[PDB]
């Protein structure tokens, strides 16, 4: 009936902020097809759970200490993995 297979962003929010390789798109995509969701961009407001980016800043890693920030290294090398992988190790929020 469900496959729910490879749902690495199941539960996952992700929005994308800055420039990243592969492209915020790219990205978003790779969320979709293992059953995940995204954002477009937030407004201060605690409307995701994810946020990608190249490198991000010391204050701005306050500003977003609420948001778990990674590198799309996560993305890209789980799906590669088909599998969740610790996000800690590709954080750029700490």
């Avoid at 798109?25 to 994810?50: A, D, N, R």
């Amino acid at each position: 009936i469900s496959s729910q297979s490879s749902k690495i962003f199941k539960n996952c929010v992700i929005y994308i902020n800055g420039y990243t390789k592969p492209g915020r798109l790219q990205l978003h995509e790779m969320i979709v097809l293992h059953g995940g969701k995204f954002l477009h961009y937030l407004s201060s407001k605690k409307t995701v759970t994810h946020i990608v980016a190249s490198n991000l800043p010391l204050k701005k890693r306050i500003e977003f200490a609420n948001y778990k920030v990674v590198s799309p290294d996560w993305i890209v090398d789980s799906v590669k993995e088909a599998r969740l992988l610790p996000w800690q190790n590709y954080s750029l929020t700490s």
